[PDB]
Design a protein around this ligand. Structure first.
Ligand code: CDL
Ligand code: UQ
Ligand code: PLX
Ligand code: PEE
Ligand code: NDP
Ligand code: UQ1
Ligand code: UQ1
Ligand code: SF4
Ligand code: SF4
Ligand code: SF4
Ligand code: ZN
Lengths: 96, 208, 144, 176, 386, 29, 115, 342, 156
C-alpha cells in the first residue's frame, strides 16, 4: 500500500518521507529511492479469521519447526478476536 | 556426573603440589605463594626481585629443567596498587610438565629483563613494553614492536579507550597521510550484560 | 583413434546449428561443447548438462542476449541467473526447477533483476525512522 | 613412535658409484622432473568456464542477508533484537515500536555489510527464522554507500531470493 | 658502511606485511631487523569487549591458514575453564578436521616456499586439492575458510549425510599428489643446493629461543604435543613423528612432507572410527538447544535467549592451553573474572618466536638464502601481529 | 519415530588408503 | 622514605643531565632530518618544535617520570635517525590539517556544548 | 534554520557543518582544495562534472560516507544546473579555462555560464553565491580573458545581487600554471621576457589562502554582497620573480628580451594545438601585464587569514623541477628575491 | 559526424585493450589474499582472462586491497598506489578493506581503504569467495568498457 507525498516521494511502510525543505532528497537525484511494495500490515489484514470450537487455541505459525515458538491463545472475550503475538493470525469462537 | 562433566586427575594434582612445595622450600627468599588449580596447573607467586634467580633455577635445575619459555605476557588490574601482573609460562620437556611464575609491578618500577635466561623473552618483553608501558632493565634493544611509529600511549591498559584517540586519513592539500582526533559515524554501543543474580556460590566473597 | 576425435569435432560443429551458431557460441562463451538441454528461462537463459564431464563442468548456462532492458550479447554476468536455476546451477540440489518447482508465494518477485550497481536504479541508503524531537511552532498572530 | 627422514647411507660399490656418476654427468633426476611436467601437460585442466559454469556450493552457504515473511505476507521479524545482541561485529542496528494494529515490528533494521563478517550468528540466534544469510555472493558495488543496507533493501532481498532460501532451509533445518 | 634495504611489505617474498630492514655487504646479509605490526589489529582488547561465543571468530582470523585448529585451541581453553567435556563424536570430528586443516597448512607452506625459491608449478598442482578441502569446509559450515565450526561445546552442527564418502574419496588419492610434488622437489639438485645446510639451528638454541613444532623436530628434538600431551582423542590414533638430523631447511621440508603423509594416515583412522551420538554437550546452560526444542519448551527458549544475549558465565580462573597447531605450539592464556566476558586473552603464536630468531638463523648467508629461511619458518602475520 | 540416521562409515569399513612414499627406480644402469 | 627504587637517576640533578644530553642529540639531529626527509620546513622550525615538546613536560618533578620521558625521547630519536619514521610521522608533530580551536568562552559557547 | 541543517559534532570528518554546497568547476586546480576544505568539516558537497568520471576519483576520499555526491551537468543546459542546485544553500562557481576551445570561448565560460548559474541559483532559492573573477578584470583590457571576466562579474551581480565576488591574482601551487609555467620554460634553453620583464609587477597569492578565504566568506554573515581582492603579501618585478623561480629549481637562468609582436607570433604558433596549448597569445599578454592595486576593496586579512608569502611555499612546487643533484636542498638556502613594496 | 565516429571507434579500441590486459600488483594483506591466490589457482585461472600478477607498481594496472589496512601500513599502501602509472584502478576486497570489518572499532585500524585511496569496486565478504572476486574483476572490466575519454575530449 504505497502512497505518494506532496513532493512525489514514495512513502515507506514505516512512514518515512523527506520533507520539502530537507536537503537529503538530493541523494535520490539521478538515482532511485528503494521502497518495498509489500506492506505486511495490509497483507496480514487480508487473512480470514479462523473459527474454532475451544476456549484455548494453539499457534506455531505453520510448518512446524519452521514457524515460530508455539503459543496458546485464549478466546473467552466474545467481542474480540484472539491474535497471535508472532504471526498476526486471528482466531475466534462461533457466534450468533 | 559422568558424561557432560570434565574428569579430574588426582595423580598429577599430587605431583604438582609436591613440586610446588619443593620449589617453595628451595627458594624461601622470593617465593610468596604456591597454588595448584583444580584442572592441574601449578603457579608460583614471587617477589619481583627474584625474577632472575627463580627462572634460572627452573631453567637449570636437574629436577626442574624448564628449558622452554612458552609465553610471557602482562595483565592489568587497576584496583591494585601494583597495577601490572607479569606471567611466565614455562615448559619442561624432560618431565613433560608446565609451570607458571607470577610477579607484579607498577608504572614506575622496572622489572629485570630475563633475556639472559631465555632468548625468547627478547620480543615478549618488547611487546609488554609496547602494550602496557612496563620498562625492562638491561634489555639489549627495547622499543615498540606492535604499534605505529610515534604512537602515544599503551593500548592494552584498561583505561585506554577501545578506538584510541587518533585516526588516519589521506589529505590532498598536504598530499600525505595525516592523523586527527577520532570521530565515529556510529559510536560503539556498550552492552550491560551481567546478571544481577550470583552464578557461582563457591567463589562468593565475604561481605566485608 | 584420431579420426574419432576429428569426427567428434565435426559433430560439435554440426550440433550448434551449423557454422554460424558454432561461431556464435565460440565467441560468446569461449566453449563449443554440446550438452543436453535441461530448461529455458523466461528471460531466455538456456541450461545444459553433461554428466560425463568432471564435477564443475557438467552443468552450464548459455545466457540470453536481452535481459530486462540491456543488450547482453557481449555483457553477461552471473547475477542474471534467477534463484531457482541459481540453486540448480551451483549444485546445491540435483533437481532442476522444471521437475522440482519452487513453492509459489504472492510476494516473491515475478521478474528477476540482475546487479544494478553503476546505474540510476542502484540502491541508495537512507534512514527509515521518523523525526525524534518536535519543535515549537510560534503563533502566526502579532503579540501587541 | 618416530621415524627418520634423512638418515640413509649410499652404497659404495663400483655399480652404485658409476650409477651416481651417470646421474651427476647426465642429469637423470632433472629429466625425471621434465617428464613429470610433460605428463601434466597432456592432462585435462581443472579450469571451469566462469561465469557460464559455477563453483559447487551447499545449502549451508552463508551469503547476502535477507529478511523473510510468513506465507500470509506478514514479516517474521518481531524485533526481539537477539541478532543485534549476538552480532560479533556490531553490524546490526534495530529500532522498533508498536505498529498501527498493535503488532511488535521494527521501524529500523540496518546491516552494515562492510562491518559484517558473514558468520551467520544472527540467523542462529533468530527464533522465527526472520534474518537469513542467502545463497547470493555476486553483489559487488561501485560505491561504499550501496553496501549499507536498510530494512527496505533487506525486505527486497527476501522477496527476491525466497524461492531459493526456502528450499535451502528445507534441506538443512533437520540439522539445526 | 653497509647498504640498508627495505624487504617488503610490498614484496612477493615478504609473506604478507613485513618490513625486513636488512644491512647487507654486497649480497651478504650482515643484519636482519624484522619490523612487524603492519597487521596488528588489536585483537586481544576487542576480545575483552566480547562474550566467549562472540570472540570465537577472531581465532579464525589469527592464523588464516589453519582456522579450525585455532578454534579447537580456544574451545579447549574455554572447556577447561568451564569444567565440561565435549561428546565423543564432536571430539572425533575435531581431530578429523584438525588433520584436514594440517594438510591445508602444509600444502600452503611447502608450495609457497617452493614458489619463493623459484618453483611455481607445485603451487598450482596442490591448490586444486586445497580447493577440494575448502569445499569440505563449506559443506560442513557454509564458509570456505572462516568456519566458526568448532565451539567450546563441541561443534556447531553435525555432518551432512554424504560428507564422509567424499572425504574418503579425496584421501584415497591425495598420496599420489604428494608423490608428484616429491618427484618435483625432493631429489632435484637445484632444490637441494638451495635448501641443504641453509638456516642451520642447534637443538639447544632452538629450545632457548622458544621454537616449537618442526623448528624443533628438524634439529632432532623428539617432541610433539599430540603424543606427549594429547587433547581430544589423539591418544586413540596411530601415527609417527618425523625427525630431522641436520637442522636445515631441507630436513624441515622433508619433515613437513612426511607429516602430510601421517595426516592422511590419521584421517583414515578417524574416518573408520567415527562414532554415533550428539555433537555438542547436553547442557543447555552452555550449548544452545536445538531449534525444535527452542520453539516447543519454555526452558529451551529461556536458555536460547540467555545464551544468545548475555552468554554463559565462566567461573573465575586462569588457564594456559596449548595445542600442536600445524605451525607449532599454539596457546591461549585465558583469564576469567566470573562473568560472560573474558577479562584477558593472551594469544601465543609460534610464528612470533620463530620470526624473532630470524636474525640468528641468517648469519653467514645471502639474500636468496634469507628468502628461503623466511619460507622455512612458516610465518603468517595474522598470528604474529594479532 | 524411525531409526536414527546419521553420517556414518559404511558397514565394515572404508577401503585402505595409501600414504607411503612411492618413487619407482625407473632407469637404466 | 616511601621506599621507592630508581630507574637510572638518583635525584633530579642526574635526571636534568640526561634531559640535557637528549636535547643536545635532538638539536644536532634536526638539520639531518630536514635534509633526509625532504621537509618543506626550516631548521629553525624543527628546533622550535623540539624545544616546544621539552617544555610541555617541564613541570614534572619526579625523577622516575623524567627518566621514563627521557627513555621515550631516545626511542623517538632512534626511530627518526634510522628513517623508520616516514615523512607523515615527522609532520604529525605540526598538526597542519587541524583547524584551530579558540579557547575563549564565547567561541566555545557558539560552536557547541563542550567545555 | 531547518533542523537537519543545524551544525553538530566537533568540526571533523563525521561532523555536520550545516553547509550544502554545489561547487561548479570542482575538478580543476582550485576545485580540489575547495572540496577538500568543505569535506574536512563535514559539509555535503555536490560536484557537477562534465569530464570522464575517472578524472573525479581523486575527490572521492575528501568526504565521509555520503558527503560527496557526483552529478553530470552541461554548461549550456539550464535544467542540469537546476538539478544540481535544487537542494544547496551555497553555490560556488570555479568554472574557467585559460584557452578557447572550438566549442567554448571566453565569452561562453566567463559570461554565459556564470550568468546561467547565478540566475538558476537565484530562482532555486540558493541564498549564498560565490563567484570567482580576476583581480585584473577590465572592460578595456587588451586581453580577451580579462574583458570577459569583467563582463561576467557585472552579469553575475545583476542576476544575483547578494553574491560575493572574489578576485584573486595569479594563484601559485602544486598544480598551478604560474610557477610550473615559468619552470617549464627551461626546455627552450632561454627565457624570453618582454622588456626583460623589468616593467611588470606581480603579487601572487597562495592556493590554500584562496580556499580558506572562500570558506570564511561562506561562514561570514557580513560578506553577502561584498567584493574581495585576494593577493599575496609581496609584490615582485617579473624578472626578479622568474630569477627566484629558477634559483629554487637550481636551473641555469638565461633571460633574453623578446619584442611584443614576436611573442604574439609565438603564442599564435602554440595556439594551434588541439590539446592543451603550451601557451597562447592571451596568456602571453596576461603574463606581461602588471597586477592592479585596489586598496578600496577588502582582502584576505578581512577574513581572518594572514597571507602566506611565496618564500615559504615555493619549494613544495619547484622541488619537482630539480635534478637529482639538488633534490635534497633545504628551503632556507636560495636567498629570497627582492620586492618592490611601497 | 566523421569525427564522432572515429573517436568512438578509437575509444572502443583503447578500452578493449585496457580491459583485456589487466595486470594487478602482487600485493596482499591478510586472509583475503588466500582467496586471491585461489582465484589464481587452476580452477578459476584468472590468467585465462588476461589477468597477470606483476610485482612492480610501475608495471601494474590494478591494486587489489585484500586484507586489513592498519595505521602503520597506510602510508606504504598510499606510496605504492602513487607509484602506479596511469590509468590505474583500485579494487577493495573484503569487509576489512571495505569499511573496517571485524576490527572497525580498533585503535590501530583504518576504517576502510577508501579513506586512503579512491576505490572503483567494492567486493563484499569475509572473505569473499574466489568466484566473488572474479565477479568483481569482471565488473571492473565492464566499467572500463564504459569510459568515454576521447569522446569527451572531442566534446571539449
Ligand atoms: C601435434 C599433433 C596434433 C594432432 C591432434 O591434435 O590430435 C589430438 C588427439 C586428441 O587426444 P586427447 O586430447 O588426449 O583426447 C581428449 C579427447 O579425445 C578430446 O576430444 P573432445 O571430445 O574434447 O573433442 C573436441 C574436438 C573439437 O574441439 C575443437 O575443435 C577446438 C580445438 C581446435 C584446436 C585446433 O577436438 C578436435 O577434434 C580437434 C583436435 C585438434 C585439431 C588439430 O591426440 C592424439 O591424437 C595424439 C597426438 C600425439 C601428440 C604427441
Ligand atoms: C601545466 O604544466 C605544464 C606542463 O605540464 C607538465 C608542460 O608540459 C609545459 C610545456 C609544454 C611542453 C610539453 C614542455 C616539454 C617540451 C620539451 C620536451 C622540449 C623538447 C622540444 C625540442 C625539439 C628538444 C630538442 C632540441 C632541438 C634543438 C633538437 C608547460 C609550459 C606547463 O606549464
Ligand atoms: C598498425 C599498428 C598500430 C595499431 C595496432 C592496432 C591493432 C589492431 C586492432 C585489433 C582489433 C581487435 C579487437 C576486437 C576484439 C573484440 C571482441 C569482442 O568480444 O568485443 C566486443 C566489442 O568490442 C569492442 O566494443 C570494440 C573493439 C574494437 C573497436 C573498433 C576496432 C578499431 C580498429 C582500428 C585499428 C587502428 C589503430 C590505430 C592506428 C593508428 C565486446 O566483447 P568482450 O567484452 O570483449 O568479451 C566479453 C567476455 N565474454 C564474451 C566471455 C562474456
Ligand atoms: C609497439 C606496437 C604498438 C605501437 C603503438 C601504437 C598505438 C596505436 C593505437 C592508438 C590508439 C588511440 C590512442 C588513444 C590514447 C591517447 C591517450 C589518451 O587517452 O589521452 C586522452 C586525452 C585526454 O584529454 P583531455 O580529456 O582533454 O584531458 C583530461 C585530463 N586532464 O585526449 C586526447 O589526447 C585525444 C587525442 C588523440 C590522440 C592521438 C591518437 C591518434 C593515433 C595515434 C597512433 C600513433 C601512431 C604513430
Ligand atoms: N589559477 C589562477 O591563476 C587563478 C584562477 N582564476 C579563476 O579561478 C577559477 C578556477 O581556476 P582554476 O582552478 O585554475 O581553473 P582549472 O583549469 O583548473 O579548472 C576550471 C574548471 O572549470 C571547468 N570547466 C572549464 N570549462 C568548462 C566548460 N566549458 N564547461 C564545464 N566546465 C568547465 C573545468 O572542468 P573540466 O576538467 O571538465 O574541463 C574545470 O573543472 C577560474 O574561474 C579562473 O578563471 C582567478 C585568478 C587566477
Ligand atoms: C605464478 O604466478 C604467481 C606469482 O608469481 C610468481 C605470485 O607471486 C603469487 C602470489 C603468491 C606468492 C607467495 C607471492 C601467485 C598466487 C601466482 O600465481
Ligand atoms: C600465507 O602467508 C601469506 C603469504 O605467503 C604465502 C603472502 O604472500 C601474502 C600476501 C602476498 C600475496 C600477493 C598474496 C599473505 C597476505 C599471506 O598471508
Ligand atoms: S553474519 Fe555475523 S557479523 Fe554479519 S550481521 Fe550476522 S551476526 Fe553480524
Ligand atoms: S531478525 Fe530475528 S533475531 Fe533479529 S530482531 Fe528480528 S526476530 Fe529478533
Ligand atoms: S575481511 Fe575477513 S577474511 Fe578478509 S582480511 Fe578481513 S578478517 Fe580476513
Ligand atoms: Zn502464529
Amino acid at each position: 500500500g504505497v502512497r505518494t507525498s506532496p513532493t512525489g516521494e514514495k512513502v515507506t511502510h514505516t512512514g518515512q518521507a523527506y520533507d520539502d525543505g530537507d536537503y537529503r532528497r538530493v541523494r535520490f537525484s539521478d538515482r532511485q529511492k528503494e521502497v518495498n511494495e509489500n506492506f505486511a500490515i495490509d497483507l496480514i489484514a487480508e487473512q480470514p479469521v479462523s473459527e474454532v470450537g475451544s476456549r484455548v487455541i494453539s499457534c506455531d505459525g505453520g510448518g512446524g519447526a519452521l514457524g515460530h515458538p508455539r503459543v496458546y491463545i485464549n478466546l473467552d472475550k466474545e467481542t474480540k478476536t484472539g491474535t497471535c503475538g508472532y504471526c498476526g493470525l486471528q482466531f475466534r469462537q462461533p457466534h450468533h | 556426573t559422568r558424561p557432560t562433566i570434565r574428569p579430574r586427575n588426582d595423580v598429577v594434582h599430587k605431583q604438582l603440589s609436591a613440586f610446588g612445595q619443593y620449589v617453595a622450600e628451595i627458594l624461601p627468599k622470593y617465593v610468596q605463594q604456591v597454588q595448584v588449580s583444580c584442572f592441574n596447573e601449578l603457579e608460583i607467586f614471587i617477589h619481583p626481585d627474584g625474577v632472575i634467580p627463580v627462572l634460572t633455577f627452573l631453567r637449570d635445575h636437574t629436577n626442574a629443567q624448564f628449558k622452554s619459555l612458552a609465553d610471557l605476557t602482562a595483565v592489568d588490574v587497576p584496583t591494585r596498587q601494583n597495577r601490572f601482573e607479569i606471567v611466565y609460562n614455562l615448559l619442561s620437556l624432560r618431565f613433560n610438565s608446565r609451570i607458571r611464575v607470577k610477579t607484579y609491578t607498577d608504572e614506575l618500577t622496572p622489572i629485570e629483563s630475563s633475556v639472559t635466561v631465555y632468548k625468547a623473552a627478547n620480543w615478549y618483553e618488547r611487546e609488554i613494553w609496547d602494550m602496557f608501558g612496563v620498562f625492562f632493565a638491561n634489555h639489549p634493544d627495547l622499543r615498540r614492536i606492535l604499534t605505529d611509529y610515534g604512537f602515544e600511549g599503551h593500548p592494552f591498559r584498561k583505561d585506554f579507550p577501545l578506538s584510541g584517540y587518533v585516526e588516519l586519513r589521506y589529505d590532498d592539500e598536504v598530499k600525505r597521510v595525516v592523523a586527527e582526533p577520532v570521530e565515529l559515524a556510529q559510536e560503539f554501543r556498550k552492552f550491560d550484560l551481567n546478571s544481577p543474580w550470583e552464578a557461582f556460590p563457591a567463589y562468593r566473597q565475604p561481605p566485608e | 583413434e584420431l579420426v574419432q576425435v576429428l569426427r567428434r569435432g565435426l559433430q560439435q560443429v554440426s550440433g550448434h546449428g551449423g557454422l554460424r551458431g558454432y561461431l556464435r557460441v565460440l565467441f560468446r562463451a569461449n566453449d563449443v561443447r554440446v550438452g543436453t538441454l535441461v530448461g529455458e528461462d523466461k528471460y531466455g537463459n538456456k541450461y545444459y548438462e553433461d554428466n560425463k564431464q568432471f564435477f564443475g563442468r557438467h552443468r552450464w548456462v548459455i545466457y540470453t542476449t536481452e535481459m530486462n532492458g540491456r543488450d547482453t550479447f557481449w555483457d553477461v554476468d552471473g547475477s542474471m541467473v534467477p534463484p531457482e536455476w541459481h540453486r540448480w546451477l551451483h549444485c546445491m540440489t540435483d533437481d532442476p526447477p522444471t521437475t522440482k518447482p519452487p513453492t509459489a508465494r504472492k510476494y516473491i518477485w515475478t521478474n528477476h533483476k540482475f546487479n544494478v550497481s553503476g546505474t540510476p536504479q542502484q540502491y541508495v541508503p537512507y534512514s527509515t525512522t521518523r523525526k525524534k524531537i518536535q519543535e515549537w511552532v510560534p503563533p502566526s498572530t502579532p503579540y501587541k | 613412535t618416530y621415524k627418520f627422514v634423512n638418515m640413509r647411507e649410499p652404497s659404495m660399490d663400483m655399480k652404485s658409484v658409476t650409477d651416481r656418476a651417470a646421474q651427476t654427468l647426465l642429469w637423470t633426476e632433472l629429466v625425471r622432473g621434465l617428464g613429470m611436467t610433460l605428463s601434466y601437460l597432456f592432462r585435462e585442466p581443472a579450469t571451469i568456464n566462469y561465469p557460464f559454469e559455477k563453483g559447487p556450493l551447499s545449502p549451508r552457504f552463508r551469503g547476502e542477508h535477507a529478511l523473510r515473511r510468513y506465507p500470509s505476507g506478514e514479516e517474521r521479524c518481531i524485533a526481539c533484537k537477539l541478532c543485534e545482541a549476538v552480532c560479533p561485529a556490531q553490524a546490526i542496528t534495530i529500532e522498533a515500536e508498536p505498529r498501527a494494529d498493535g503488532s511488535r515490528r521494527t521501524t529500523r533494521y540496518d546491516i552494515d555489510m562492510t562491518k559484517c563478517i558473514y558468520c551467520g550468528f544472527c540467523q542462529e540466534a533468530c527464533p522465527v527464522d526472520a534474518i537469513v544469510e542467502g545463497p547470493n555472493f555476486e553483489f559487488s558495488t561501485e560505491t561504499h554507500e550501496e553496501l549499507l543496507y536498510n530494512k527496505e533493501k533487506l525486505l527486497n532481498n527476501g522477496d527476491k531470493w525466497e524461492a531459493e532460501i526456502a528450499a535451502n532451509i528445507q534441506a538443512d533445518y533437520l540439522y539445526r | 658502511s653497509n647498504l640498508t634495504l627495505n624487504f617488503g611489505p610490498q614484496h612477493p617474498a615478504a609473506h604478507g606485511v613485513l618490513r625486513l630492514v636488512m644491512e647487507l655487504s654486497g649480497e651478504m646479509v650482515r643484519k636482519c631487523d624484522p619490523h612487524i605490526g603492519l597487521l596488528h589489529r588489536g585483537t586481544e582488547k576487542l576480545i575483552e569487549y566480547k562474550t566467549y561465543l562472540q570472540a570465537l571468530p577472531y581465532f579464525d582470523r589469527l592464523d588464516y591458514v589453519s582456522m579450525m585448529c585455532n578454534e579447537q585451541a580456544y574451545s579447549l581453553a574455554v572447556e577447561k575453564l568451564l569444567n565440561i567435556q565435549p561428546p565423543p563424536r564432536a571430539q572425533w570430528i575435531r581431530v578429523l578436521f584438525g588433520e584436514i586443516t594440517r594438510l591445508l597448512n602444509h600444502i600452503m607452506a611447502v608450495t609457497t616456499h617452493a614458489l619463493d625459491i623459484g618453483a611455481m608449478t607445485p603451487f598450482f598442482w596442490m591448490f586444486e586439492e586445497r580447493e577440494k578441502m575448502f569445499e569440505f569446509y563449506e559443506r560442513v559450515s557454509g564458509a570456505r575458510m572462516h568456519a566458526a565450526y568448532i565451539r567450546p561445546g563441541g561443534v556447531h552442527q553435525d555432518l551432512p549425510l554424504g560428507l564422509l564418502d567424499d572425504i574418503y574419496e579425496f584421501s584415497k588419492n591425495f598420496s599420489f599428489r604428494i608423490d608428484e610434488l616429491e618427484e618435483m622437489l625432493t631429489n632435484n639438485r637445484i632444490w637441494r643446493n638451495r635448501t641443504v645446510d641453509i638456516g642451520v639451528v642447534t637443538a639447544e638454541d632452538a629450545l632457548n629461543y622458544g621454537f616449537s613444532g618442526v623448528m624443533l623436530r628438524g634439529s632432532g628434538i623428539q617432541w610433539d604435543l599430540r603424543k606427549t600431551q594429547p587433547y581430544d582423542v589423539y591418544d586413540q590414533v596411530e601415527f609417527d613423528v618425523p625427525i630431522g638430523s641436520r637442522g636445515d631447511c631441507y630436513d624441515r621440508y622433508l619433515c613437513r612432507v612426511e607429516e602430510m603423509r601421517q595426516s592422511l594416515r590419521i584421517i583414515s583412522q578417524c574416518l573408520n572410527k567415527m562414532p554415533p551420538g550428539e555433537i555438542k554437550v547436553d547442557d543447555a546452560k552452555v550449548s544452545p538447544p536445538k531449534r525444535a526444542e527452542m520453539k516447543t519448551s519454555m526452558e529451551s527458549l529461556i536458555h536460547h535467549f540467555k545464551l544468545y544475549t548475555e552468554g554463559y558465565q565462566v567461573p573465575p580462573g586462569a588457564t594456559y592451553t596449548a595445542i600442536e597447531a600445524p605451525k607449532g605450539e599454539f596457546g591461549v592464556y585465558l583469564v576469567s573474572d566470573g562473568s560472560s566476558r573474558p577479562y584477558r586473552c593472551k594469544i601465543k603464536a609460534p610464528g612470533f618466536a620463530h620470526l624473532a630468531g630470524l636474525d640468528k638463523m641468517s648469519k653467514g648467508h645471502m639474500l636468496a638464502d634469507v628468502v628461503a629461511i623466511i619460507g622455512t619458518q612458516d610465518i603468517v602475520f595474522g598470528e604474529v601481529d594479532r | 519415530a524411525s531409526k536414527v540416521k546419521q553420517d556414518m562409515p559404511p558397514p565394515g569399513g572404508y577401503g585402505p588408503i595409501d600414504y607411503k612414499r612411492n618413487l619407482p627406480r625407473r632407469g637404466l644402469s | 622514605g616511601t621506599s621507592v627504587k630508581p630507574i637510572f637517576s638518583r635525584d633530579m640533578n642526574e635526571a636534568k643531565r640526561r634531559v640535557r644530553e637528549l636535547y643536545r642529540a635532538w638539536y644536532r639531529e634536526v638539520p639531518n632530518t630536514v635534509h633526509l626527509f625532504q621537509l618543506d620546513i626550516s631548521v629553525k622550525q624543527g628546533r622550535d618544535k623540539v624545544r616546544e615538546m621539552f617544555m610541555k613536560n617541564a613541570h614534572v618533578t619526579d625523577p622516575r617520570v623524567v627518566d621514563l620521558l627521557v627513555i621515550k625521547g631516545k626511542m623517538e630519536l632512534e626511530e627518526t635517525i634510522n628513517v623508520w619514521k616516514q615523512r607523515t610521522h615527522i609532520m604529525r608533530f605540526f598538526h597542519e590539517t587541524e583547524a584551530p580551536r579558540p579557547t575563549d568562552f564565547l567561541s566555545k559557547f557558539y560552536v557547541g556544548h563542550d567545555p | 534554520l531547518h533542523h537537519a541543517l543545524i551544525p553538530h559534532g566537533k568540526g571533523g570528518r563525521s561532523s555536520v557543518s550545516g553547509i550544502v554546497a554545489t561547487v561548479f568547476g570542482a575538478t580543476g586546480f582550485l576545485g580540489r582544495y575547495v572540496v577538500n576544505h568543505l569535506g574536512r568539516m563535514g559539509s555535503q558537497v555536490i560536484v557537477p562534472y562534465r569530464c570522464e568520471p575517472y578524472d573525479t576519483m581523486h575527490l572521492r576520499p575528501m568526504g565521509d560516507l555520503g558527503q560527496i555526491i557526483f552529478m553530470e551537468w552541461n554548461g549550456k543546459d539550464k535544467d542540469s544546473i537546476r538539478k544540481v542546485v535544487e537542494h544547496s544553500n551555497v553555490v560556488i562557481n570555479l568554472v574557467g579555462r585559460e584557452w578557447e576551445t572550438k566549442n567554448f570561448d571566453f565569452e561562453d565560460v566567463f559570461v554565459k555560464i556564470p550568468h546561467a548559474i547565478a540566475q538558476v541559483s537565484k530562482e532555486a532559492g540558493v541564498e549564498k553565491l560565490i563567484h570567482i573573477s580576476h583581480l585584473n578584470a577590465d572592460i578595456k583590457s587588451p586581453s580577451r580573458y580579462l574583458r570577459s571576466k569583467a563582463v561576467g562579474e557585472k552579469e553575475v551581480r545583476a542576476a544575483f545581487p547578494e553574491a560575493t565576488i572574489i578576485k584573486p591574482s595569479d594563484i601559485f601551487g602544486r598544480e598551478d600554471r604560474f610557477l610550473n609555467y615559468f619552470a617549464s620554460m627551461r626546455w627552450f634553453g632561454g627565457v624570453p621576457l618582454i622588456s626583460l620583464g623589468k616593467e611588470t609587477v606581480k603579487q601572487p597569492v597562495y592556493i590554500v589562502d584562496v580556499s580558506k578565504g572562500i570558506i570564511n566568506a561562506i561562514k561570514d554573515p557580513d560578506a553577502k554582497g561584498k567584493t574581495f581582492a585576494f593577493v599575496g603579501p609581496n609584490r615582485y618585478l617579473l624578472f626578479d620573480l622568474v630569477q627566484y623561480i629558477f634559483a629554487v629549481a637550481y636551473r641555469p637562468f638565461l633571460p633574453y628580451p623578446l619584442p611584443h609582436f614576436a611573442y604574439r607570433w609565438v603564442g599564435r604558433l602554440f595556439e594551434v594545438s588541439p590539446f592543451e596549448p603550451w601557451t597562447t597569445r592571451d596568456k602571453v599578454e596576461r603574463v606581461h601585464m602588471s597586477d592592479m592595486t585596489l586598496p578600496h576593496l577588502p582582502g584576505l586579512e578581512d577574513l581572518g587569514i594572514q597571507a602566506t608569502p611565496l618564500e615559504l611555499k615555493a619549494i613544495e612546487v619547484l622541488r619537482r623541477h630539480r635534478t637529482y643533484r639538488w633534490l635534497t636542498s633545504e628551503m632556507e638556502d636560495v636567498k629570497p628575491a627582492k620586492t618592490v613594496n611601497i | 559526424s566523421r569525427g564522432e565516429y572515429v573517436v568512438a571507434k578509437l575509444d572502443d579500441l583503447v578500452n578493449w585493450a585496457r580491459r583485456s590486459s589487466l595486470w594487478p600488483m602482487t600485493f596482499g594483506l591478510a586472509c583475503c589474499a588466500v582467496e586471491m591466490m585461489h582465484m589464481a589457482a587452476p580452477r578459476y585461472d584468472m590468467d585465462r582472462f588476461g589477468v597477470v600478477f606483476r610485482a612492480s607498481p610501475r608495471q601494474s594496472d590494478v591494486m587489489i586491497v585484500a586484507g586489513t589496512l592498519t595505521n602503520k601500513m597506510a602510508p606504504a599502501l598510499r606510496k605504492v598506489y602513487d607509484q602506479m602509472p596511469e590509468p590505474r584502478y583500485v579494487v577493495s576486497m573484503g569487509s576489512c578493506a571495505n569499511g573496517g570489518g571485524y576490527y572497525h572499532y580498533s585503535y590501530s585500524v583504518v576504517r576502510g581503504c577508501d579513506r586512503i585511496v579512491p576505490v572503483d569496486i567494492y567486493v563484499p565478504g569475509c572473505p569473499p569467495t574466489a568466484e566473488a572476486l572474479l565477479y568483481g574483476i569482471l565488473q571492473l572490466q565492464r566499467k572500463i568498457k564504459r569510459e568515454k575519454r576521447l569522446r569527451i575530449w572531442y566534446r571539449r
